[PDB]
DNA sequence: CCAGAACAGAGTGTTCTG
DNA sequence: TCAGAACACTCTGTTCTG
């Protein structure tokens, strides 16, 4: 059964070139094409799994880029 | 005007005896009351303030704790 | 002034569709 | 195969009321 390479919850398939759970996939559309303040309260060093993944979305977005999540050619 | 002693926001007065905004004194009775499964993502002392105090609800909690706020005062 | 109620929004995650 | 639309929910924050 297959795990979402961001926060490791279970994945539906390859989603912007990563494989992914759903609530990443949309998540990361929406960042990287949206206006948000997301700034880490941490270390840019957080857990990202399916109970915090609310928690930081700095962290998320960067564990989305980190994989080489992308909305396709330029 | 006066600062908030949890978020650093403007504080809307003295709530649950701590010099706090309206924002802070809501969620201290909620999560004193309720029941949530708050759950720090960093090492337990993530930064709350205006931007990043819907981060951490744990810490945020803590902090509100340490700063004596209770619901009796 | 302050507590609690009422009211409203941000951000998220799911179901559905081709 | 996967991308997008759009509704429903959770937690949150502000205005109102006593
Ligand atoms: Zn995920
Ligand atoms: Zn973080
Ligand atoms: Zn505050
Ligand atoms: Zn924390």
Redesign the pocket.
Known sequence: SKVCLVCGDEA??????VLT???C???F???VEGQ??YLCAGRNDCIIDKIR??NC?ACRLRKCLQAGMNLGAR
């Not at 539906?12 to 070139?17: K, L, T």
């Open positions: 539906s398939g390859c989603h912007y070139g759970c759903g609530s996939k949309v998540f559309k929406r960042a948000h303040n993944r609310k979305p």
